[PDB]
Amino acid sequence: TIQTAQRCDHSDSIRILGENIKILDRSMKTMMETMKLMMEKVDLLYASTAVGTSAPMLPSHPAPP
């Protein structure tokens, strides 16, 4: 009875899971920024080559929620 509880407790494991999820979130943010840099470069290049022609303004973001 008494010993059957702590075995059912996994506070450390859940904390590790949460910390790993936070690491995932951090790396996701880093990817967001790197992708934003890529988008900046490509968008600016496309816009520069666009002036003087009728090239369509291709969307650069999926959609509002």
Partner: protein, 1636 residues
């Protein structure tokens, strides 16, 4: 119709004329081409014709105008009671209208205006050959054909408008200049103006060069001024321009003006829009504009890198702002490699200074979501004055089909039907704006549809740039995007940025400016002015991409902002120049590089006006900080004023040079080539807010503002009323901003009379009396707007225009030869049959009159049918066509049921109403641009006929002689009562709440030369600190100078619950109001007179009638003080000098009405159901007030201690602690406030630094501090009734009331013995009382009760048969014997009245005052300084009770017995005896002999009178009881011991005070009193040390000299009392007392 303009409002364009001259096929062009003579000057040279127009002298009989202006000005001034000024004004205008040149200019202006009025808005096509002197103007549709002899000048109608506008501006300028010269230290500068006009008109250079000269005239003058009065930093700005090489005469004239007076030169040269305007060179201007838009000064990669740097600095500044505001870092993410310092700062939450110099560290920090973007703008700004187009399918509309056919050879295929709903309003009505976020989604996604990728470039009108200053008119979607982005940036970002916050805030900015105005003169804090000439055509996508991406991440509006930085790359730009259309291929314009451009780098002018400011501040800050110089930035956009403070390291010259170099370098990197031809460094001249300060004093704008003709007849069809209203608004604005009220008023009267002359027929014009009465009638009682009857001109705040109107009419009737019948037949009063409560709620001060002259607008009529057509119904278009007017009328009538009818509160209630918001929205939708122009354009015959209809109607109305309501009974007696009666009659319910009287009627000025006592019974006294003269008028003196509806409803709920009322109906109405919004649960004076005010001291001594009772009267102090200062200004400017103090006495008794402190009891249950469709989205106060006051004062002191000497001249307490009365404060039991302050101070427990600062400044007194404390603490009642003080009174020793208050308020940190006793009282809920509702508690405590009484404590008196008790007043003072001798002499002579001159010692006068059964008459000569000093010194009511103020202020020489003169009849004289030859029973040594009119007065038999409760002037705190002296001595000893522990505190001043008590104790003990004693003070082993012998090298030696035995100590020198003193005293204190 045609020629639908009466003022110049479009840029001149010669394209149409050139096209016509090329054999155009248009019939009217053919007609015009057949009339030009042989020599046809090009339209570019239109000014070359209109400069040669000369009318025969004296063509218009304007003599009646001169007489009328004279009479009107005389009446106005007399009504103001400044009669002595009349002459000046009464002459100046006459002179202005008698000078041949000015008269000729005025006649030319009248002829021009008549010509304009005979042609504009004409049904006819071509008007016959109108004559304008030697011209032969011949209009043809929108084309004019000027003709001076054998010289035609075929031009566009806009050119003629420009010429007429030039003539009007010149007339305004001449009249204003003459009037100003009259009222001006060095007057009559009209000659220079005329010479300048002739010189400029003599220029003969080509068009471009002429306009270059005209444009450069003003900057060149600035350069000349700077190059002559730059003390520190050298300037060469004047050398850039080429005026000296092109117009030598103009250069010489400017040099002469500079020699005379720089301010005069700056004023005269500021008139830019008064010389004929240029014809923009479209062919060479549009191409240059387009090329400049898409030029690349920097490679895109370098631009992107610098953009990243700008992003870094922006992040740093935003983080600093956010943490300074919310005391925590915003949600941020640190990329790998972030510096540990940033990590720690975020973890704790703070802003380490090192960041500001190390912004580069922030490149690794990215700000996460901080807010959200509100895709829902309010209608108020969405439809502001900015023309737009429906969509891309509209460009064909803005061109001429015939010109397009001629240019290419094919039709335009213009859609016959209107392809778009005109301007913003029509498109809005069509229902497009129903769903905003759905409309902005393409921006969010980043692909704006092809329909919204067009922008039209429109040249800017009324400018001197030959090549144009194109601005942008954009399709609807882009306009909505710009509005939303600008709102978001202005709300959720800009306030955080430090640089812009200090300019957004009204108060903060002012402080800064004041500081600068007080520093540039001193030789430090110079200024750099930068002028980015290519600001708008600058920013490229790369520079904005980083910050734009960061912003998009902030608001989680994916790519919403970023789209703006690349949109111009996909946009199509065209030039709005009819008769020059771009070619079309497939329904879209083609690119030619001159008229059309497919895609450019920048969005255009105005677009993203905010983000650009953010970036500009960013790179300027980067430029400056990298050289480590303190600075401030004030940016108006194109131009930036950078204040650079002095640095001890280098002089100003080197600092300025380095700053300029850095700014150039760091603005080049951002692709903004900053040519050094418009940026200059100065320390004497600087511009901000379009005001040009010179040496910190604003340069008068009279010449500029009065010469700046506005649009006129705006948003309506032409009519006399609109023109008069615009003129009146211009005059009021000129007076309010920066101008002499007299100059503005006189110029306004002259211009108003001229305008009437233009329109009205000879029948009315040639009638002097009728013209005068018509000009004085005013709009209030119903009449054409006028600049005369505007009390708001002189005064700043809210004004009641009715009583002033009646006062003016009374004065007119009484002075001029005009009878009441004429006024009746001019006013034509007619009470409305029924109350129109809507008008009252909209305008509380108005009457129920029928405003016959007011123009009835019909804009609602056009849009009412527009919504009906096409049945479009999704928005305001449909759910605002409900009977909103009827619902508003119902609500107003419902509000009318208030028993004590209060129109002010009525309007307040009818402000938090959904119906009120709907009405306001309708009004803005009507009275705005982009609607009238659109509505007028679609339907214009209506306005064409309406103009003539209105003109005929008004002429007929003015001509008829039938009288209206007999206004006789309201043109006699007090104007205040008359106004009340008139309001009651016209309304029928006796309005109470708005009748504040006419100050001039209320108060009559007078000079103290011969003022009688009665005049001083109720008066406000002004004292000039020296003789006043015109010089003082400029040199400063020394003396001190949406969602809101729900919160408003809750605030009003709290306010009305505080006032102790129970109105179920009002609660029901408020609940109904809140139901819709969804909450269904629960001194200062005016600008003109400040400088003169600084040399004057105000007061309030009429308390004898109107300030003793707690009841508040109708008086308005701001207005009264402004009026008095205006009187002084008038006396000065009329050639007089104000030497003696002068008063404003109370004249009209009935104009002082006790304010009705009643509450409204609204009777009928409200019937305003609601407007569900509107608004889509959703214990006694004395204790609380006392605790709030204590904590407020504590925090005020806490902020004052921080401020330095340079930051204390500002009187702005922490939060506006000053706007309070005196009685209100006296209501609160002061004991409570004192306990609260003590508890706050002890709880605060500040360390040594703050404690030392408090000690020093409180023993001193500066700023919103002990200064205002003493202000509040004149009344001695509070002191003896202040429970803390009475217990403390026997515990401390003082020397003046300015020291007792300091000891009382510093008790917490000096005498814990009693403060820790009173600290017992406490209540947690009282602590929670927030200060945001501070005023609520004060209002709740407004009528608590009655303030305490003053009592009259006695002084040691004497009698013939008395008992010598040995007590004598002023024992410590040297004048002790003198004061006692005077008292004995007075009692021996049995005087009932005594005169005291200011020469007598203040202490002696006070002691004489405390005598009973004696009347004191100070010879103050109108200056209450001496009496104020006596009142401050005393601590009882004897002075206030026994000093006759009305007689004292009215007495220049004594009448009877007096003291202070050395000789004269009845003068009391004391002759000091060389040797004391008599031992008076009361006075041991008689040191003086009393004489009266050369006769000695015997006082030998005099003896002491039985003493009783004595005043504090006897210094009871140290009483006969040595134990009391022991208490005081021990307390001071402990306080000094505590002070010694304060590092860095100058303890010497306290040590002298303590040594005084030590001397007293030594005298008591019998020890010798050494003249000098050396004290050694220091902290040894963490303990205080105060010893006369140096036993530690660290003790600071302090020497105290001048020690003398206090005679007051003689009484305490009892033999048995010596032992009791030393019993129990501290060992150190005993050692100090005992002299070795």
């Amino acid at each position: 119709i045609n020629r639908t303009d009466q003022s110049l409002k479009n840029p001149l364009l010669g394209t149409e004329v050139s096209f016509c001259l090329k054999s155009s096929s248009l019939p009217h062009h053919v007609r015009a081409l057949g009339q030009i003579k042989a020599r046809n000057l090009a339209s570019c040279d239109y000014y070359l014709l209109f400069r040669q127009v000369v009318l025969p002298p004296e063509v218009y009989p304007i003599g009646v105008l001169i007489r009328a202006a004279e009479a009107i000005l005389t009446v106005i001034v007399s009504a103001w009671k400044l009669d002595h000024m009349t002459k000046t004004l009464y002459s100046s205008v006459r002179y202005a209208l008698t000078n041949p040149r000015v008269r000729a200019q005025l006649e030319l202006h009248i002829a021009y205006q008549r010509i304009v009025g005979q042609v504009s808005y004409s049904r006819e096509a071509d008007i016959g050959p109108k004559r304008l002197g030697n011209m032969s103007l011949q209009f043809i549709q929108s084309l004019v054909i000027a003709t001076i002899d054998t010289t035609s000048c075929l031009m566009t109608y806009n050119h003629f408008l420009a010429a007429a506008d030039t003539a009007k501006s010149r007339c305004h300028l001449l009249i204003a200049s003459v009037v100003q010269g009259a009222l001006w230290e060095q007057g009559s500068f009209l000659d220079h103006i005329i010479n300048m006009i002739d010189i400029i008109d003599s220029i003969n250079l080509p068009h471009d060069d002429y306009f270059t000269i005209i444009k450069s005239i003003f900057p060149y003058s600035q350069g000349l001024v700077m190059g002559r009065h730059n003390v520190s930093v050298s300037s060469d700005f004047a050398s850039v321009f080429a005026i000296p090489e092109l117009c030598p005469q103009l250069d010489s004239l400017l040099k002469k003006l500079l020699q005379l007076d720089p301010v005069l030169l700056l004023m005269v040269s500021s008139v830019q829009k008064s010389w004929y305007f240029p014809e923009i060179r479209m062919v060479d201007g549009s191409r240059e504009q387009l090329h400049k838009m898409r030029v690349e000064l920097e490679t895109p990669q370098a631009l992107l890198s610098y953009g990243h740097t700008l992003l870094s600095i922006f992040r740093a500044e935003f983080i600093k702002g956010y943490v300074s505001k919310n005391a925590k870092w915003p949600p941020v993410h640190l990329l790998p490699g972030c510096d540990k310092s940033i990590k720690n700062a975020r973890e704790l939450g703070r802003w380490s200074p090192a960041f500001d110099r190390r912004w580069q560290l922030f490149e690794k920090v990215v700000i996460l979501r901080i807010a959200d973007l509100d895709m829902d703008p309010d209608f108020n700004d969405i439809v502001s004055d900015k023309a737009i187009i429906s969509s891309r399918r509209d460009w064909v509309f803005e061109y001429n089909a015939a010109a397009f056919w001629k240019k290419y050879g094919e039709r335009l295929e213009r859609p016959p039907a209107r392809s778009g709903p005109s301007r913003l309003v029509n498109a809005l009505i069509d229902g497009r704006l129903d769903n905003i976020p759905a409309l902005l989604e393409p921006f969010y996604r980043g692909a704006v549809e092809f329909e919204d990728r067009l922008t039209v470039l429109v040249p800017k009108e009324k400018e001197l740039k030959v090549k144009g200053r194109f601005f942008s008119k954009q399709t609807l979607a882009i306009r909505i995007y710009q509005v939303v982005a600008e709102a978001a940036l202005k709300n959720e970002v800009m306030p955080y940025l430090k640089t812009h916050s200090m300019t957004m805030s009204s108060t903060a900015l002012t402080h800064l400016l004041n500081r600068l105005s007080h520093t540039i003169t001193k030789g430090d804090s110079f200024v750099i002015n930068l002028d980015y000439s290519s600001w708008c055509n600058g920013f490229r996508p790369e520079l904005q991409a980083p910050i734009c991406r960061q912003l998009d991440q902030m608001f989680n509006c994916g790519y919403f902002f970023r789209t703006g930085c690349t949109l111009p790359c996909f946009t199509t730009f065209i030039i709005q120049d009819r008769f020059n259309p771009p070619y079309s291929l497939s329904g879209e314009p083609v690119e030619d590089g001159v008229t059309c451009a497919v895609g450019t780098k920048t969005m255009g002018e105005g677009m993203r006006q905010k983000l650009w400011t953010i970036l500009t501040s960013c790179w300027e800050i980067i430029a400056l900080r990298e050289i480590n110089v303190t600075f401030n930035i004030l940016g108006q956009g194109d131009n930036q004023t950078i204040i650079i403070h002095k640095s001890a390291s280098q002089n100003n010259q080197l600092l300025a040079e380095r700053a300029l170099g850095a700014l150039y370098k760091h603005a080049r990197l951002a692709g903004h080539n900053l040519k050094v031809e418009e940026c200059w460094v100065s320390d004497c001249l600087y511009e901000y807010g379009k005001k040009l300060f010179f040496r910190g004093v604003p340069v008068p704008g009279c010449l500029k503002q009065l010469s700046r003709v506005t649009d006129s007849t705006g948003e309506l069809f032409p009519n006399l009323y609109s023109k008069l209203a615009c003129l009146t608004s211009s005059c009021l604005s000129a007076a309010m901003a920066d101008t002499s009220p007299w100059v503005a008023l006189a110029t306004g009267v002259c211009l108003y009379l001229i305008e009437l002359y233009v329109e009205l027929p000879p029948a009315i014009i040639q009638d002097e009396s009728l013209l005068t009465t018509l000009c004085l009638v005013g709009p209030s009682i119903g009449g054409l707007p006028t600049p005369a009857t505007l009390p708001s001109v002189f005064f700043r705040g809210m004004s009641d225009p009715l009583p002033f109107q009646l006062a003016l009419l009374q004065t007119l009737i009484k002075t001029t030869g005009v009878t009441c019948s004429l006024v009746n037949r001019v006013v034509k009063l007619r009470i409305a049959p029924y109350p129109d409560w809507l008008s009252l709620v909209t305008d509380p001060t108005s009457l129920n009159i029928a405003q016959v002259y007011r123009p009835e607008r019909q804009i609602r009529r056009w849009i009412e049918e527009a919504i009906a057509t096409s049945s479009h119904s999704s928005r305001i278009a449909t759910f605002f066509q409900q009977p909103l007017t009827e619902m508003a009328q119902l609500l107003a009538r419902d509000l009318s049921t208030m028993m004590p009818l209060r129109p002010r509160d009525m309007s307040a209630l009818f402000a938090l109403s959904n119906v009120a918001y709907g009405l306001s929205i309708i009004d803005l939708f009507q009275k705005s641009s982009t609607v009238v122009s659109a509505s007028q354009a679609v339907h214009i015959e209506d306005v064409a006929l309406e103009s003539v209809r209105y003109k005929e109607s008004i002429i007929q109305g003015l001509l008829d002689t039938t009288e209206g309501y007999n206004m006789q009974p309201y043109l006699e007696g007090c104007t205040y009562l008359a106004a009340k009666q008139l309001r009651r009659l016209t309304w029928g319910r006796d309005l109470v709440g708005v009748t504040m009287p006419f100050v001039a009627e209320q108060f009559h000025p007078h000079s103290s030369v011969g003022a009688k006592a009665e005049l001083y019974l109720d008066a406000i006294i002004y004292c000039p600190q020296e003789t006043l003269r015109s010089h003082h008028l400029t040199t400063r003196g020394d003396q001190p100078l949406a969602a809101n509806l729900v919160k408003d409803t809750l605030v009003l709920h709290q306010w009305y619950k505080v006032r102790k009322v129970t109105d179920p109906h009002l609660n029901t109405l408020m609940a109904r109001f809140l139901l819709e919004k969804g909450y269904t649960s629960d001194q200062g004076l005016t600008g003109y007179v400040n400088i003169l005010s600084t040399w004057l001291r105000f007061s309030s001594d009429y308390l004898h009638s109107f300030s003793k009772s707690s009841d508040d009267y109708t008086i308005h102090f701001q207005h009264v003080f402004t009026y008095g200062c205006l009187y002084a200004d008038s006396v000065i400017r009329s050639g007089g000098v104000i030497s003696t103090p002068y008063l404003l006495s109370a004249s009209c008794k009935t104009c002082f009405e006790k304010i009705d402190s009643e509450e409204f009891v609204l009777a009928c249950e409200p019937q305003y159901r609601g407007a569900e469709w509107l608004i889509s989205k959703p214990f006694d106060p004395c204790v609380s007030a006392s605790y709030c006051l204590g904590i407020l004062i504590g925090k005020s002191f806490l902020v004052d201690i921080r401020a330095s000497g340079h930051d204390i001249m500002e009187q702005r307490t922490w939060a506006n602690l000053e706007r309070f009365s005196v009685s209100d404060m006296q209501k609160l039991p002061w004991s409570i406030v004192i306990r609260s302050l003590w508890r706050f101070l002890i709880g605060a427990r500040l360390l040594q630094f703050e404690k030392a600062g408090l000690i020093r400044m409180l023993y001193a007194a500066t700023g919103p501090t002990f200064s205002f404390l003493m202000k509040v603490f004149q009344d001695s009642a509070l002191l003896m009734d202040c429970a803390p003080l009475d217990r403390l009174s026997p515990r401390i020793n003082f020397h003046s009331r300015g020291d007792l208050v300091a000891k009382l308020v510093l008790l917490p940190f000096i005498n814990p013995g009693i403060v820790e006793i009173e600290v017992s009282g406490i209540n947690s809920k009282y602590h929670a009382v927030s200060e945001a509702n501070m005023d609520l508690y004060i209002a709740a405590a407004k009528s608590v009760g009655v303030k305490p009484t003053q009592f009259v404590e006695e002084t040691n008196d004497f009698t013939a048969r008395g008992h010598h008790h040995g007590c004598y007043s002023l024992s410590w003072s040297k004048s002790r014997n003198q004061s006692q001798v005077l008292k004995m002499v007075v009692r021996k002579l049995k005087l009932c009245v005594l005169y005291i001159y200011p020469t007598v010692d203040p202490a002696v006068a006070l002691d004489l005052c405390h005598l009973p059964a004696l009347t004191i008459i100070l010879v103050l000569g109108g200056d209450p300084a001496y009496y104020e000093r006596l009142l401050e010194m005393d601590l009882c009511g004897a002075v206030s009770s026994r000093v006759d103020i009305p007689h004292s202020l009215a007495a220049r020489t004594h009448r009877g017995f007096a003291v202070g003169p050395d000789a004269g009849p009845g003068v009391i004289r004391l002759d000091r005896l060389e040797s004391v030859c008599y031992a008076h029973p009361c006075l041991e040594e008689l040191e003086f002999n009393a004489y009266l009119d050369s006769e000695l007065v015997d006082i030998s038999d005099m003896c002491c009178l039985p003493l009783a409760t004595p005043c504090k002037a006897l210094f009871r705190p140290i009483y006969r009881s040595l134990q009391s002296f022991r208490l005081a001595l021990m307390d001071n000893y402990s306080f000094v011991m505590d002070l010694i522990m304060i590092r860095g505190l100058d303890i010497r001043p306290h040590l002298e005070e303590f040594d005084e008590l030590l001397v007293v104790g030594q005298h008591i003990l019998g020890q010798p009193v050494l003249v000098e004693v050396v004290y050694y003070v220091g902290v040894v082993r963490k303990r205080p040390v105060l010893a006369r012998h140096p036993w530690s090298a660290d003790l600071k030696r302090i020497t105290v000299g001048g020690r003398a035995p206090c005679p007051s100590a003689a009484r305490l020198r009892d033999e048995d009392c010596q032992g009791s003193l030393l019993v129990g005293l501290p060992a150190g204190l005993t050692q100090l007392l005992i002299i070795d």
